[PDB]
Amino acid sequence: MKPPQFTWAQWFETQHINMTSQQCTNAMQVINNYQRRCKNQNTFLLTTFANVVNVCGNPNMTCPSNKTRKNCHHSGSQVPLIHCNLTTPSPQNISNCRYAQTPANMFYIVACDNRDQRRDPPQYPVVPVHLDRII
Numbered sequence: 001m002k003p004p005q006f007t008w009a010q011w012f013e014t015q016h017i018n019m020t021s022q023q024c025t026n027a028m029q030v031i032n033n034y035q036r037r038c039k040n041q042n043t044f045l046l047t048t049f050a051n052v053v054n055v056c057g058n059p060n061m062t063c064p065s066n067k068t069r070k071n072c073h074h075s076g077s078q079v080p081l082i083h084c085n086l087t088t089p090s091p092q093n094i095s096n097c098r099y100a101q102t103p104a105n106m107f108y109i110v111a112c113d114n115r116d117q118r119r120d121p122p123q124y125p126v127v128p129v130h131l132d133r134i135i
C-alpha cells in the first residue's frame with residue numbers, strides 16, 4: 001500500500017528514513033496524506049539511506065514478520081529511532097490525526113531487494129523495501 005509514484009525503496013525512505021519533522025504528528029501527515037489513511041503505528045530510523053543500504057549487505061536472515069522470507073537483514077548496531085503511535089484518529093479528515101512519539105535505541109531488521117530497474121537510481125543496485133522489525 002504505497003502510492004504509484006514511488007518504488008518500494010522510495011516508499012521505504014518516505015516511511016522510515018525521511019522524518020520531515022521531529023514531531024510525529026507532522027511527520028505522519030506525509031505518510032497519511034500519501035496512503036489516504038492515518039497509519040496506526042510507524043517507526044522512523046534515525047539513520048541514513050546509505051547506512052540502511054549497507055545493512056542490506058549484511059547476511060541474509062529470515063524475516064521475523066514472514067517465516068517464508070529470506071530477504072531480511074539485521075543492522076548489527078543499535079540506532080536511535082522514533083516510534084509514532086496514533087493518538088487521535090480521523091477517518092474523515094487525515095490531516096487532523098495526532099500522534100505520540102516514543103524515542104528509543106534498537107536494532108532493526110530490513111528486507112532488501114534488487115532496485116526497481118525503471119525508476120530506482122542505478123547508484124544503488126540493492127535497496128531496503130520494508131522495515132520488518134525493531135528489536
Ligand SMILES: Nc1ncnc2c1ncn2[C@@H]1O[C@H](COP(=O)(O)O)[C@@H](OP(=O)(O)O)[C@H]1O
Binds near residue numbers: 001070
Ligand atoms: N520479506 C519481505 N520482502 C519485501 N517486502 C516485504 C517483506 N515482508 C513484508 N513486505 C512488504 O513490503 C512493504 C513495506 O512496508 P513496511 O516497511 O511498512 O512494511 C509492505 O507491504 P504493503 O506496503 O504492500 O502493505 C510489507 O508488508
